[PDB]
Assembly symmetry: C3
Homo-oligomer: 371 residues x 3
Amino acid sequence: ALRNQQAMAANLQARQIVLQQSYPVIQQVETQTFDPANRSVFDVTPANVGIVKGFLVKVTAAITNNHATEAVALTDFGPANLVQRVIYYDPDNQRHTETSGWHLHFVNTAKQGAPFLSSMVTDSPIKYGDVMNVIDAPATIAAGATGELTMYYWVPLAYSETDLTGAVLANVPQSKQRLKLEFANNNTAFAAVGANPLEAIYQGAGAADCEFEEISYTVYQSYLDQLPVGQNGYILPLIDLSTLYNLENSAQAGLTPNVDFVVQYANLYRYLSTIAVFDNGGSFNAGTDINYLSQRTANFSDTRKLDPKTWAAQTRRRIATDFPKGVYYCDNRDKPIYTLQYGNVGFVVNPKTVNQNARLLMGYEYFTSRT
Amino acid sequence: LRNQQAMAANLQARQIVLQQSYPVIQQVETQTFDPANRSVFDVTPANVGIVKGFLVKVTAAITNNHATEAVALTDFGPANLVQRVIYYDPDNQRHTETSGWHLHFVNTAKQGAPFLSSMVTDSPIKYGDVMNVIDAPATIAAGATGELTMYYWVPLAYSETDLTGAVLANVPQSKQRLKLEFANNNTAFAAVGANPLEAIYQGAGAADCEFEEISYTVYQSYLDQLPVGQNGYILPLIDLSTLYNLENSAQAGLTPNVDFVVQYANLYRYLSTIAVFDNGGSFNAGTDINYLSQRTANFSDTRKLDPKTWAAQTRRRIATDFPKGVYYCDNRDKPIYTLQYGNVGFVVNPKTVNQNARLLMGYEYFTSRT
Amino acid sequence: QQAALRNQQAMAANLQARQIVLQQSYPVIQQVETQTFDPANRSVFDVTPANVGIVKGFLVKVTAAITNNHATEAVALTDFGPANLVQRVIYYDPDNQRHTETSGWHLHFVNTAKQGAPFLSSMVTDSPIKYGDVMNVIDAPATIAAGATGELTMYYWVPLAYSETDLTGAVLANVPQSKQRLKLEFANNNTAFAAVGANPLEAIYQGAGAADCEFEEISYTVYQSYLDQLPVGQNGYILPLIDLSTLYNLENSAQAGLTPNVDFVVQYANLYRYLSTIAVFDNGGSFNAGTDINYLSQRTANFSDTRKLDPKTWAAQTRRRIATDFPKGVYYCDNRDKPIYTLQYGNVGFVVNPKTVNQNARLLMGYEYFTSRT
Ligand SMILES: [Cl-]
Ligand SMILES: [Cl-]
Ligand code: NA
Ligand code: NA
Ligand code: NA
Ligand code: NA
Ligand code: NA
Ligand code: NA
Ligand code: NA
């Protein structure tokens, strides 16, 4: 136990020194403009330099609705669905995050404490506001019109700007990293009336005649350069750099009215946050199809069994607003769910109404060691 | 000497408790009723671990049975769904005893923004007021029924990380008492021209408004699995021997252009002060006040400010203004504390004073159990 | 050789004394002066603050009534609007040393940057309880119609100390001999109103009725924030000597010579530790939302850019700092945790590579920095 306490102390000190001595850099890695009808999957090759903290991905797109008369309107996720999936592999080909664009975006929001890169509305007479359209998409695209969209995603390796847990040391000249981006295409972006809008950007009677004109992306890599050297070479937080900080998502089915649907935290990961999306057969409701949600331990005791509005209240304290309809969030950052500290734990949803093809899309944020 | 070590130990124990125990939020009671029959309830919380506070959810349906006239929300609106709250701990010592609106304003001051609100942004992703956590229709038309939702946090512990004021109830045995007095058909509706201070809706149809029903659910927040050491449970004795209370009072006797001073009592460490200028039923946006201040006898004013400048300081604390006639003062970093009664006072020099004018004061403070 | 231990010890002593001062003294905010005037008669004032204890800064309240006397045309707020009620502010301490010397718009943008949101603004929420813009702390009508009179209110915080907890830059004002001086150069009928097609940079309103707009009056009230009842010890008053011997200043400048697709570089001077940088691209009177820029960057002598970004990505970083965008053509850069200091690395420069350059284009730079009094 002394070897550990000292190991953690050494790690923190090394982290603190790296942060004080190195200088942060953010620089463009690659940009590409394309038509997803031609290609929608791209493998970006990050530069191998210093300690890598994450990637900021700018995505723009132009969409045209050529329907003769009908419009389409943004889905609840909208531009967050411009990227369908993101997967990162480090120089040792160890996979870190692999999740959907919508889940990654919701975590970006949770970590910011407000809708990611949004512009807050105030009474200021000075002309602050949505000036630069950092994340933007027209509410509707009428028949015959073309809309322009902009979206940003932060793909994290390091947990934060000050906590390097999960960061990647990329100083091995011949071992490349891989950032795979799978973009939306005409098939995923447009949903007909009555179809499931989960993965779509726009939905409406004009959907069949909507097409992307183009999508463009620019990946910026954030890293620390001029790493401090000491009496043993680079001073590095060994625990930070051998821990993976990942996001992943999965789908669970088998819900029945008034019965507890339990999703066990199946791995021995340290779960920092959990997102549960109740895709009630293509319908996304504002809590009205749920009796309660909870986190429960094998001891059968609930640590937070709450009605939907009260559950939402806790989230409002975290992001200053509510996540979209049917999206529920749970913060476990200070005391991560770890099944080896207490019995197995489960995330619980007791549904009031269950439509055909109902399912819970689970999104997790967690730490785990490489070994 | 000493103390340095007493506080050092208290803080160490607090840290161990926060690190080792596990937080739980649990429903302890729910009830639906008709205020025509009853509006005062005494909730019995569970005696388990260290209790931090209670989240009280209140929902109500209001029917405007008037034939042709509507009513509209007052400035406090749903914050008046609970008229008063009183908490007694296992040792029969009272902590908070205040109005629902004062409790709500403190919840907002502590959050740094309107309590449990949804902030509006340009995000195209559909975040927003999706769940209507705190909600009430702006107006209820003649013949219509409106649905309202309100939440209040009754604190024992000062915060999630500062357990000062928390209550140990894992042992006490004796019961705790959380008393709640709800709005009723006599307090919720104000006629045009009547004082709207304690009401939820005001308007020409008020006389014919009534509650269809009210429901409440109390959730208790506490720490379980308390850490044990040599001498036994590791506990922050100072935290648990200190009361963190909210209290209200009313003062009258205001006259144009004369300093109206409300004295702070001794012994209490006042963290915040709220003063509501109920100018005879009229609530104005500072236009009826010359200035407000906090003053020490023989040391003058530490912050004598015009109303807008006073409001500017508040905008730095809650990112907006409190409702008309509601003034806030933050003294958290250096609490008002006098060894002599009234060695410090809160001042309001009114420009205009209507009949039946008064200041409704609200205080947040720390004080020793002994 | 070494002996640098002195610095280490000096820093510790400075921090200890700062803490003692913060713990023992009591904060006071007090009105020092209020005046109502007609800008046609005068617009420059020199305020003499009180010499009491350690001065942290000044909160300046400014109100105005503007009438648009045009027979038919209206005027509308410029992007800066009421932030241009004060054109320039300059502070001198008792030793007659200059601290902040900048434009009202720059001071206001820094007030916003340090708050983490539009300065003293009222956010909008779904709360049914009537919070909101109740007190109109900073306010100005979006337009003033022909024949109408509009009322404005704006506030500026002129900092001496860096913050309420970091007294770096604060001023000890106890010498009865020499007075401090806070100079305010206000807007007047020649700066506040821009005709259609004229440069709106320094104006409050712009539009077809501008030539007939006039101030009815402007009023200001200066409140001084300071620490009184300073703690004493064996060696007398306990005081953070480094904090009180360091200047925390805001200054602005102007540079021209931009050409399409060529890097325009503005060098940071040596000795100053730059906490933030603001660059306003006054493209010949046109202020655009990034569309006239290829990219912006901060660069060191080594061709090494630490953040060469396209305008929207640059704007994204700013949204993380103030929760919204600064007005069109206004770009912000936060270097608070690692201040730009040309001694730490080679010379450093702020870069703008413009896509389009109109005649009379220029970059207006605003800086926040720390520097030794000596
Ligand atoms: Cl009943
Ligand atoms: Cl005059
Ligand atoms: Na192809
Ligand atoms: Na609502
Ligand atoms: Na009645
Ligand atoms: Na009372
Ligand atoms: Na306003
Ligand atoms: Na003029
Ligand atoms: Na200068």
